Design a protein around this ligand. Structure first.
Ligand SMILES: [Cl-]
Ligand SMILES: [Cu+2]
Ligand SMILES: [Cu+2]
Ligand SMILES: [Cu+2]
Ligand SMILES: [Cu+2]
Ligand SMILES: [Cu+2]
Ligand SMILES: [Cu+2]
Ligand SMILES: [Cu+2]
Ligand SMILES: [Cu+2]
Ligand SMILES: [Cu+2]
Ligand SMILES: [Cu+2]
Ligand SMILES: [Cu+2]
Ligand SMILES: [Cu+2]
Lengths: 317, 316, 316
């Protein structure tokens, strides 16, 4: 099918952690950017308008651009950048399946490293693995890092000389993340993305993960893990069988990443919360103001298209 | 079987490197903590007494906690912390096989990153791989990193603003590590653990490693490597066929990790020493005061239980 | 067959990036060091002369040194170092196949980390994989990092306290790297090496890579990837089918590594340029002074032995 989307690039501020507000260049004014969910073989058209003060592009990571290399989104290689206030149209066929993503390719150390210019691109295979057909919940986890010294000033950041002192999944640091709520018998697909500049050792308590896909393509030899290392650019898809009711934390195991501004706890932490488990008065997330779409799991059920999410939206000046 | 162990948490000082003594919270007053070795299906009970000034827990990494999530050891999620002076009992069924480990889950960046709050938990499958059948020596290597500026002071460390400037296997930096002594024909299983917050590229000279297990679970497609990357939380099990007599160094290949306080050599370095190879006058470890249990290889032959090691104990 | 050659160690200066000249200890005065290309089973003899002011060795990473451990190149373990002005001969049998490498094993954090003391050692298997027999272009990519503060300062660098601020493939930072020029229907073998102290996430636009070998040994279960993580000491071999004409960048995806002294772009970046794609006036490499051997692809076709490359030579 032909699927055409209109996207903008916006200057907004997001709250990453308690007391860390961050200036970002959010696709449609949000970080992570909108989910794009299409089927293998679709013809995708994305019309991009740059409503920011700086040039950008969009590169479609994992899209082969078969005969469409001029839509690869690389400044000085496949296009000139999209200048401030201008527009540009990308066209490609989604012939590469799986968990893909998209991100700016201008000034990437800063724009991708700390300005939130990235989002997920999910291409459904026409022939999914049998296990993918058992899945009852699909979960996107995009990990990145943040340098508080440059929170308030575009044009700086993302170098070896900066200090990454805050860490997130889907642009929030615990306790501002949200739980992953399941019930016994769920079959959970988790898609990990190395969206920023860090390495993240994602560990699920209470469960092993079956690693089924690397960079969106299915492994001939899937393997179990309780800790999956995710580095910049990579994606891993795993399956968790939710057959062990409890409250089981699920987090980056890199010790300095479970901090926020030098304080603990913080960072890319969630909890696999099973519906049937009674809640204790001392539970950190008792009475959480819950967002069921923090991992895009509701949008992923709503058919093909492009989906914004207000839990990811920042504030305009 | 039901296996019941009593553990304490102690404030002790260990010698990590020449030039670096470090204040740690040692399980049974040692770093690495005691080896816990049990069989698949056993009912484990661990009674923990906190003889320190700060709260702690123990999380059993890789243990599913099937029917027992209140023993997972996560403060504010599965329990309230074990306060100073207090005790607490963990109970779980060891239904998950392989190389597991345990560690504090309070203030983890500091307590696991630099205060030594970790140890190995080995669960033997009731049905081991065929390769495991041939093994003649089992070896534990737990890698971690240290920040000298906070060596003397609990309550600081383990953040991106600190500097990790010493590196170890089993809480020693070369030359205070120990050789891995083998004889021709040994079949050596090595279990690597990313115990601290660093990444470690473990490279064996003279030999390839057959990577057989990830996080304790056997791979359907094992693969050879001469360098195995180990990151925080992970375990890898390998097999080395000791069929090449010599002295072969075995170390983290991350360049800055073979330093100690800015000087080289240091860090996670051992030597695979084969019995019978003549020792040269200039060999760095000629006359080493040898510890045959530095990798827990003697304790791993002693059956199921909880095993302390005097060479890992710290001082009060 | 017996393969004998002579290597020196030289104090030279190379250009890593615009504005950054770097003092190195180059094998045969070049960085990367000379390519050594042999066949499985060859007997290798390397006569080394140290024409520098400091001691060095050469370790042959991946070479088992079966019955020849005294040629492993480890100071204080298998030999005394090669002092300034002295010479030393290595002898070993190349019975381990695939993508190997060699590097100094003295003061490794500095000498390997920032002084360029490394090069590639390719051992052709008697029985290549079927896909290897289809290869039309063989490509070596050795990644490393540089600390500009110690560019002029032998005896310094390579510690946690230093800052790696420049990044390269084959000792150049973009734009001083070279394009990977292909034609439609090429079958490209790329060998990635973690030569320095960094981690590199190598991502090919426009193409998936088939990962076929880890540390030179063929995987029983190869797998596709668009991003391959390469850490110190490791090698990965991949295949790209060049069936998608365009200009497709190919680079380290670690965000801080596509910088040079804090400026962007820089770092380990190339472009897969297909023959016959029209060139826009804004293409960054439209006027490139092209070196077809920047990835050793021409040397790899010229027989068994040791190959220097003038584009990698430094100045005395
Ligand atoms: Cl439930
Ligand atoms: Cu941008
Ligand atoms: Cu990308
Ligand atoms: Cu890409
Ligand atoms: Cu945990
Ligand atoms: Cu603790
Ligand atoms: Cu853990
Ligand atoms: Cu755990
Ligand atoms: Cu070595
Ligand atoms: Cu040297
Ligand atoms: Cu090496
Ligand atoms: Cu080696
Ligand atoms: Cu790119």
């Amino acid at each position: 099918a032909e699927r055409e989307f209109d996207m903008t690039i916006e200057e907004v501020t997001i709250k990453v952690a308690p007391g860390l507000d961050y200036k970002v260049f959010g696709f449609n004014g949000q970080v992570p950017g909108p989910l794009i969910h299409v089927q293998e073989g679709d013809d995708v058209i994305v019309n991009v308008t740059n409503n920011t003060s700086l040039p950008h592009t969009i590169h479609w990571h994992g899209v082969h651009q078969k005969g469409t290399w001029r839509s690869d989104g690389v400044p000085g290689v496949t296009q000139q950048p999209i200048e401030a206030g201008d527009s540009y149209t990308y066209k490609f066929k989604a012939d590469r399946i799986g968990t893909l993503w998209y991100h700016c390719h201008v000034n990437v150390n800063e724009h991708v490293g700390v300005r939130g210019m990235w989002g997920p691109l999910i291409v459904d295979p026409k022939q999914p693995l049998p296990i993918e057909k058992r899945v009852t919940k699909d979960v996107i986890m995009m990990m990145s890092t943040w340098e508080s010294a440059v929170a308030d000033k575009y044009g700086e950041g993302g170098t070896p000389m900066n200090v990454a002192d805050y860490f997130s999944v889907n642009a929030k640091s615990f306790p501002l993340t949200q739980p992953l709520r399941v019930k016994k018998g769920d079959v959970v697909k988790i898609r990990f993305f190395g969206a920023g500049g860090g390495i993240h050792a994602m560990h699920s308590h209470g469960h092993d993960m079956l690693v089924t896909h690397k960079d969106g393509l299915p492994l001939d030899s899937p393997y179990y893990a309780d800790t999956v290392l995710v580095s910049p650019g990579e994606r891993y898809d795993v399956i968790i069988e939710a057959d062990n009711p409890g409250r089981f934390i699920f987090h980056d195991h890199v010790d300095t990443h479970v901090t926020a501004g030098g304080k603990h706890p913080g960072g890319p932490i969630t909890v696999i919360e099973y519906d049937g488990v009674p809640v204790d008065d001392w539970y950190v997330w008792k009475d959480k103001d819950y967002d069921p779409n923090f991992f895009y799991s509701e949008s992923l059920k709503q058919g093909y298209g492009m989906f914004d999410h207000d839990g990811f939206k920042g504030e305009f000046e």
